[PDB]
């Protein structure tokens, strides 16, 4: 819930730059493309550890 809604706000970050010229269409695409990858890590990292810390 946590690390995910963080990505939900971070998307609004990457979008907020898209309107400032900072991020064009292609580089904003890479920032949002990596956002879901980092979240993709933050989740599995949570899974495994969750099992080890609670239900091994």
Curated annotation (Swiss-Prot):
Q: Which gene encodes it?
A: rpoC
The source organism is Thermus aquaticus
Membership in a protein family: Belongs to the RNA polymerase beta' chain family.
- The disulfide bridges present are none
Self-association state and partner proteins as the record states: The RNAP catalytic core consists of 2 alpha, 1 beta, 1 beta' and 1 omega subunit. When a sigma factor is associated with the core the holoenzyme is formed, which can initiate transcription.
**Protein name, UniProt field:** DNA-directed RNA polymerase subunit beta'
Q: What does the protein in this record do?
A: DNA-dependent RNA polymerase catalyzes the transcription of DNA into RNA using the four ribonucleoside triphosphates as substrates.
């Amino acid at each position: 819930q946590r690390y995910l809604e963080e990505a939900d706000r971070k998307l609004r970050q990457i979008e907020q730059a898209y309107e400032m010229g900072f991020l064009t269409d292609r580089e904003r695409y890479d920032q949002v493309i990596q956002l879901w990858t980092e979240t993709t890590e933050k989740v599995t990292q949570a899974v495994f550890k969750n099992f080890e810390e609670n239900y091994p």
